[PDB]
């Protein structure tokens, strides 16, 4: 790869975008870096996206990230 790397680790520390802000900084159709992140990540699903603003107080940002670990949780107490 090429940015899929560089934005999958600038994104997992520090704030992220969408595939917007992607395609943007990459230089290509949105759809090309979508579809090859996709892959790259796991293989078509369009990514993880997710926002936030609730939840911590008035961000409202969006992202899509390659999501190594385990966000998926049940508190089962």
Do not use: C, H, P
Not at 31 to 58: C, F, H, P
Not at 60 to 77: D, H, K, P
Request: zero cysteines.
């Amino acid at each position: 790869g090429m940015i899929l790397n560089e934005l999958k680790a600038a994104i997992e520390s520090k704030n992220g975008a969408t595939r917007q802000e992607l395609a943007r900084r990459f230089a290509l159709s949105e759809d090309g870096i979508d579809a090859m992140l996709a892959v790259w990540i796991k293989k078509g699903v369009l990514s993880r996206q997710q926002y936030i603003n609730a939840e911590d107080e008035v961000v409202r940002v969006r992202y899509v990230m390659n999501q190594v670990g385990s966000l998926a949780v049940n508190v089962t107490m």
